[PDB]
Design a protein around this ligand. Sequence first.
Ligand SMILES: Brc1cnn2c(NCc3cncnc3)cc(-c3ccccc3)cc12
Length: 278
Amino acid sequence: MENFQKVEKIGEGTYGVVYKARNKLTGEVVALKKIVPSTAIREISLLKELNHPNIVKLLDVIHTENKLYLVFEFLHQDLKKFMDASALTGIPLPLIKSYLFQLLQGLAFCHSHRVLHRDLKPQNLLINTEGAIKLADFGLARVVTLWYRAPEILLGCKYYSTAVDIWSLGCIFAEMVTRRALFPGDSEIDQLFRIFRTLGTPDEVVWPGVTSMPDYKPSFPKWARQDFSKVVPPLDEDGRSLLSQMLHYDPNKRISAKAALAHPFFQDVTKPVPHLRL
Ligand SMILES: Brc1cnn2c(NCc3cncnc3)cc(-c3ccccc3)cc12
């Protein structure tokens, strides 16, 4: 640690405080996360090899004094701040599409290595001046916001898979378009019920096996599904079709990152430069 000079606190991650810091040696500016079980050390070590342009690079892992520090590449802004900053005007559709495409490329990569994020949220999607967007805190999982949590997690599924990340990204996609959180639940049941109220209460017809799930209750209220035209106006039909697929109840039916990349929505994708005030 003596090799780093703390510049400032850039948030309070789920595991510890994250600091912008300077390598007293190389002079490199990095993000320093202060989080040990051998399993954790080994798992984290694996993440160091998981390199991709849309994944925040984990530079080094430092274990000392039974303490654990993760040194990451530093990015100046996150999607939440950018969304807040662009609230009056909204993020231009072409930039939303570019960001969604890049994130799907990142997910496609991680997923192909059997690595899940599990906690995707605007705060952990980092952006730069070049129009790039990157997933932060990938593989780390293996008040905390429930807004992006997939229904199978909320329903007590113990062995959920990659589809949970597609669900979270579908929620974030909707939020970028509408400028309002899709399902801002403030408790597990409120989260579940917000999802039901919009997509309809799931049943054996649309989600075979849902009624047997651990936290499923026959006493759940039965709400009708709403039309996406009401959910994310004025997103075009291509966008709404993609969204509807990323939000399928059945994790097995939910579109994969790979398939999502081929969706017609991305036929005209480009890479705009955002306007960032750093
Ligand atoms: Br790795 C990493 C690399 N950059 N980075 C950023 N940068 C965005 C930023 C935010 N505030 C000031 N400067 C830059 C935020 C978080 C993060 C922090 C807290 C919670 C979740 C993610 C992690 C992280």
